[PDB]
């Protein structure tokens, strides 16, 4: 419905293990009660949900692949278990539910490159 802006880095490298952590900051209209954050994979011109979490108070964000906690405007995200096939464009989608109204923010994408040893 109503929209807000989501910023995230364009390119992120993995570690040898498969650690790809980035920051997803959203231009919040204000301080919200329920915020649902979602990570989306555009690897093959197709969308696949990866993370999915929601918190109904201040900074109590607790997510499987995704380890990460939220700090106000910025959610600190980490993705484990990345193979070279996991390479793709990851979109951080932020939904703030309550209080009304509904604000939706779609990030341009974080291209994560993963190789394997």
């Amino acid at each position, epitope marked *: 419905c109503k929209a807000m802006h989501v910023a995230q880095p364009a390119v992120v490298l993995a570690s040898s293990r498969g650690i790809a952590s980035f920051v997803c900051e959203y*231009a*919040s209209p*204000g301080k919200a009660t329920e915020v649902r954050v979602t990570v989306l994979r555009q690897a093959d011109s197709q969308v696949t949900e990866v993370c999915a979490a929601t918190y109904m108070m201040g900074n109590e964000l607790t997510f499987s692949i995704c380890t990460g906690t939220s700090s106000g405007n*910025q959610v600190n995200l980490t993705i484990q278990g990345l193979r070279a096939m996991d390479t793709g464009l990851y979109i951080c989608k932020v939904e703030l539910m309550y209080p*009304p*109204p509904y604000y939706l923010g779609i990030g341009n994408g974080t291209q994560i490159y993963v190789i394997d040893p």
Partner: antibody
Amino acid sequence: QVQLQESGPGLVKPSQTLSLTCTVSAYSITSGYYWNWIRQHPGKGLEWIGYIGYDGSNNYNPSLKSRVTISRDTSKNQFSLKLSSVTAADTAVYYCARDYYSGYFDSWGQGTTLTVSS
Amino acid sequence: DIQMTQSPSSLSASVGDRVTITCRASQNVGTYVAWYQQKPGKVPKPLIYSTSYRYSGVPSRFSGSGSGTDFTLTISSLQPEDVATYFCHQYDTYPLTFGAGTKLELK
């Protein structure tokens, strides 16, 4: 687009009850946002009086909790301020502004000017 | 409450300069700070929200900076239309508090 228009008396004698109405158009109070009242003293900063939400919920500044009542008329799309036992310290320019829950003031009314004089 | 101390109280500047207005929060508020432009005899107009994002329609010369307790509003290239009074504002903890205001003079 969302428009807010203040309305009220020019002057208020001391110890009266102050009444202003903020007529909102192009958006409905009951849908979702928090609707605030703000005054600005001559020569000082901006003071936040309080709000009323879509939910009917109220919160007022602890400085002005006892002297302030903010009420709304759902049919007319208005939310009004009631400030009682006024003093000369209440001479200010009064604004009504839209807000998200603890957020930036998305829209403002033109603001109305009120003088506490005898 | 939470006190937002705004500096400078009033400044003088010529067109083309770069002016910075500071607003020091007595307590940490994170990124929940906004900047508003009140023109002389006019309505306040929101410029900066979330401490770094321009309101829809704000020219690019306006930029918001700051982290934690210190916040700055920056005009890259000053213009005649920008002569106004600028206010900072928190939205992390009720009650909401503004700054004392900073006034712009054309030198």
